[PDB]
Structure 1
C-alpha cells in the first residue's frame, strides 16, 4: 500500500548473518527497514558486558530515534541475527516523504509505541522479579513470537543459556541450574532446544 512508494525510494542491502548493521554512538543519518529476516538490539557497558533489548523482524523500522532531532547518535547496537534485506533511506529524503504522505510517519510511530511499552515492562521485570521469574517470562514471550514452531504440546525453540543470559541479565550457569529447576518443577523440557509446555 503505502510501503511500496516508500520502499521504492530506498537503497536495498543484504547483510550476512552476524553482521553489524549499527554501532553505538555512530552519528545517526540513515533510517532502515527490514525487508527480510531478523536483527538484534543490544547495548554495552564499557567493561564489555552486553544485554539484548529486543529482537526486530521483517516489517519493523530501524534507527528511528535518531530521526527526530539530529546531531545525535545510534542509541543501541543492531547485529544481524541472520540474512536480511534492508532498505536504507537518508533521514533527509524520509523527512520529505512524510510531507507528501502522513501514513509512513504513523507506521513508524505505531512501531515506537509498542516498543516503549515492551521496554517499560522489561524495566519492571528487572526490578520486581528475581531471575527465576524473569526467565519464565522470557521462555513464555520467546516461545511464541515467529521463530517458534508448533510443538505438539507446548511450542519449541532454539536458544542458548548464554543468550537467555543476556535477555534476563544473569549468566549461562545461573541460567543453567535455574532452567533445570523448571524441567524438574516440570513447566519446560530442554536439550539445546527448549520445549515449552
Structure 2
C-alpha cells in the first residue's frame, strides 16, 4: 500500500540505478522519502551537513551559489528525470556548497548518502558495474552533443548568408563579408573547424560554390530546407 510498484520503473531508466540489482534497488528505496515542494521552496541550504542526494521527477529546481555582493549566480539547472548533487557523495563532502531551490511546484525523492555509499563499498563488482554504464552513457551524451551542436552550426551559417542574400532574389551572387573563411567563424561565435565542414559539404552537393570569400548561390529554393 506504500507507494512502490510503479516508482521502480522511473529509476530503472536512470544511469545510477541501472547497475543496481532489484534487491539493491529496493534496499535503497526503503530509506528514501517522498518530498513535495511549492513555489520558492528550498531543497537544501549552503551550510547544512550533506547526508542525502535528490532525484527530481517533475518540475524545475535551481542550484546556483550564494556569490558575494548579494546576488545569486546560477551554475546549472536540473530538469525532470535527472539526479543532482549526487557527486557530493563519493567526494566525501561534509556539507553542501550550494543552496538548491525550486522555482515551480516540484516533487523530489530523498535518497540517503549513507544508504547508497555503503552499498558501493565492498563487493566492488558493483562499483565496476557502476563505472560501466556510467561511461557508456557519457559517450552517448557527447555523441548527441556532436550532432546537436552541429545542427546549430549548420543553422547560423545559412542564416547569416540569407540575411545578406536577400538582395535581388533569383540568382544570388552578391555576398559581402570582408572576412576570410576561418576568420568569420570566430566572429559568429562558433567552432572554427565546423565552418570548414559545412561550407565544403554544400559544395560537394552542388548548391554553393566557393572561390575565395566570393560566395555564389546557385539555387535559393534548395537552401530553404537547411537553414
Place the TM-score, normalised by the shorter chain, in its bin: 0.3 to 0.5
If the length of structure 1 is used for normalisation, what is the TM-score?
0.47
Larger Rg: 2
If the length of structure 2 is used for normalisation, what is the TM-score?
0.42
